[PDB]
Enzyme design. Structure first.
Site, PDB file in Angstrom:
ATOM      1  N   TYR A  66     113.928  18.562 -29.414  1.00 46.58           N
ATOM      2  CA  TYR A  66     112.622  17.984 -29.672  1.00 46.58           C
ATOM      3  C   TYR A  66     111.881  18.894 -30.652  1.00 46.58           C
ATOM      4  O   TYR A  66     111.257  18.482 -31.622  1.00 46.58           O
ATOM      5  CB  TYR A  66     111.694  17.669 -28.472  1.00 46.58           C
ATOM      6  CG  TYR A  66     112.408  16.925 -27.403  1.00 46.58           C
ATOM      7  CD1 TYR A  66     112.807  15.582 -27.553  1.00 46.58           C
ATOM      8  CD2 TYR A  66     112.686  17.608 -26.221  1.00 46.58           C
ATOM      9  CE1 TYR A  66     113.493  14.943 -26.502  1.00 46.58           C
ATOM     10  CE2 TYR A  66     113.350  16.986 -25.172  1.00 46.58           C
ATOM     11  CZ  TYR A  66     113.776  15.649 -25.322  1.00 46.58           C
ATOM     12  OH  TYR A  66     114.427  15.118 -24.233  1.00 46.58           O
ATOM     13  N   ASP A 125     112.878  18.811 -19.424  1.00 45.65           N
ATOM     14  CA  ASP A 125     114.143  19.468 -19.733  1.00 45.65           C
ATOM     15  C   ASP A 125     114.058  20.977 -19.524  1.00 45.65           C
ATOM     16  O   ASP A 125     115.030  21.592 -19.074  1.00 45.65           O
ATOM     17  CB  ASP A 125     114.580  19.098 -21.148  1.00 45.65           C
ATOM     18  CG  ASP A 125     115.145  17.679 -21.224  1.00 45.65           C
ATOM     19  OD1 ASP A 125     115.564  17.142 -20.180  1.00 45.65           O
ATOM     20  OD2 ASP A 125     115.173  17.101 -22.317  1.00 45.65           O
TER      21      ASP A 125
END
Ligand SMILES: [Ca+2]
Ligand SMILES: [Ca+2]
Lengths: 305, 313
Positions: free
Chosen positions: A125, A87
């Site tokens: 995350y 990402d």
């Protein structure tokens, strides 16, 4: 014929002005005349789908987190830190690289939303880690990310297409990232939540996926818009490129997931979950999936998640 | 007698990997160990400030809009389309260009938020036009934008810094756009709302400004962070560049505002409003404003609109 909006043909977007050697009259984006109505549909959906990880009370996952062994917690931290790397690449390199290859003014700014939202995925995350993980677990996962060659080979695979000067190959990479490369990792939280573990984390994963599905769809839509204008010979060259790249990334993904999940027996299942989405990626670029039902089998409890 | 995070120094961000010729081990962003706490503060503020134009009941401006003459309505549509051009430049070129010049991994993604939010700013003018303007007014204004040289010269002025290879000059441009260049246009809605016209439109402008203020502050913070490490010669060279570029943009802005507002008498007031913000821009880069009180005077009713504080997302 009383054509409307003739100014558009007499002007350039700012990025075109820059690309053409500082030449041309620059036009503003016109949100009242959308050249491709699909762009308005996508802008509306992605902005309506705005979210941030702090909206989800991950602290309610602490009870189930503490029932997982240190080895499972390490697997989760490593898997998610590896997703964070992908990402990070897409937010800072891949989606921003699509801006100058756009067909419309509205598409240019849609890709700025994609980049920002992928940055939100990466930030999420870390938000989960802040609540669940120790400082040592977080640091060891970062050291594992930089030192795991199977992970780095996937991270390195698409970057040249974003940096180099073939816009269609860059577009394929931009669809491959959200359409394929993270699913082998997303398998893990869904496996866990099917077993009653980390339900709030899986809510974050579902918000990430809701964005990813649109990013893959939209990049595949724009790919097809350009490729359809090419000669049959060049269309054939591009299909061969797409399949060659996909198979290369599938082989890299299989090697990585086999290493990642070796101690847990999850790799063969995660690979089928990954390849199922490889077929969806191909379909979103206008091609038929060659993969069999057995190659793409997802168990009902996972598909429910 | 008597008896952390090393991986970070052994790795590179993805942008750095590419800048080095595809060399190095790539690291994930670490949102648990933030190198500069200012980045976390700014990330939190800009994301918590997310908004979309649907937040504002712009149709409630229709009654006051209908009291305006066609010439005032044309002025508003032109002014806002010119602002949309500057926001289009910043969203698609300027803020994106700051990503690879970041000092930290977190700053790289903060500038992706800036780019997207400036795209929302440009979208918001379009939402206003959808509500208030005829299709003919909208098209006229776009035609006028492409054909008005004083406007184009401002749009052209910063673009070379974004695409050329001096990161500090590019950073100065990235602060000058939100810190200065749109204020001469923002004067107009505030002038109107101080007189009871288009009050909801000014609520959109204040949501835009809440973002712009942070964009200018943060780019000026990062400018200072880099410049403070440079030689005295280089620091003085950069100060000279900042003042030279600002004064050049002030001259372009004065010529444009005089043309834009020529039938309405607003240019002299809008210029002082603009130059007041030129001073704030300088302060956000660590410099003293040289402008006088008379050069920066803003009438109280306008200052109230500028200063007022700005359904969930
Ligand atoms: Ca298995
Ligand atoms: Ca006056």
């Amino acid at each position: 014929a009383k054509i409307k909006n003739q100014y558009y043909n007499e002007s350039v977007s700012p990025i075109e002005y820059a690309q053409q050697g500082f030449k041309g009259k620059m036009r503003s984006v016109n949100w009242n005349v959308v050249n491709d109505e699909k762009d308005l549909e996508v802008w509306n959906r992605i902005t309506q789908n705005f979210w941030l990880p702090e909206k989800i009370p991950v602290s309610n996952d602490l009870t189930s987190w503490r029932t997982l062994t240190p080895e499972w917690q390490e697997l989760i931290t490593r898997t998610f830190t590896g997703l964070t790397l992908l990402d990070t690449i897409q937010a800072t390199v891949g989606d921003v690289a699509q801006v100058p290859n756009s067909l419309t003014d509205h598409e240019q700014v849609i890709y700025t939303n994609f980049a920002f939202m992928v940055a939100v995925h990466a930030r999420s995350y870390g938000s989960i880690f802040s609540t669940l993980c120790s400082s040592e677990q977080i640091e060891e996962a970062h050291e594992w990310v930089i030192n795991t060659e199977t992970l780095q080979e996937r991270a390195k695979a698409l970057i040249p297409y974003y940096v180099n000067d073939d816009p269609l190959k860059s577009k394929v990479a931009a669809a491959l990232m959200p359409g394929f490369l993270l699913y082998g990792g997303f398998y893990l939280p869904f496996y866990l939540s099917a077993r009653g573990k980390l339900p709030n984390t899986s809510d974050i994963i579902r918000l990430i996926l809701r964005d990813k599905v649109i990013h893959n769809y939209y990049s595949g839509y724009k790919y097809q818009k350009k490729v359809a204008k090419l000669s049959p010979e060049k269309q054939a060259e591009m299909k061969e490129f797409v399949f060659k790249l996909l198979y290369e990334l599938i082989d890299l993904e299989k090697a990585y997931l086999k290493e990642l999940y070796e101690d847990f027996g999850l790799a063969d299942d995660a690979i089928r979950f990954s390849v199922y989405n490889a077929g969806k990626f191909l379909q979103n670029l206008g091609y038929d999936s060659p993969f069999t039902e057995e190659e793409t089998r997802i168990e009902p409890e996972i598909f429910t998640q």
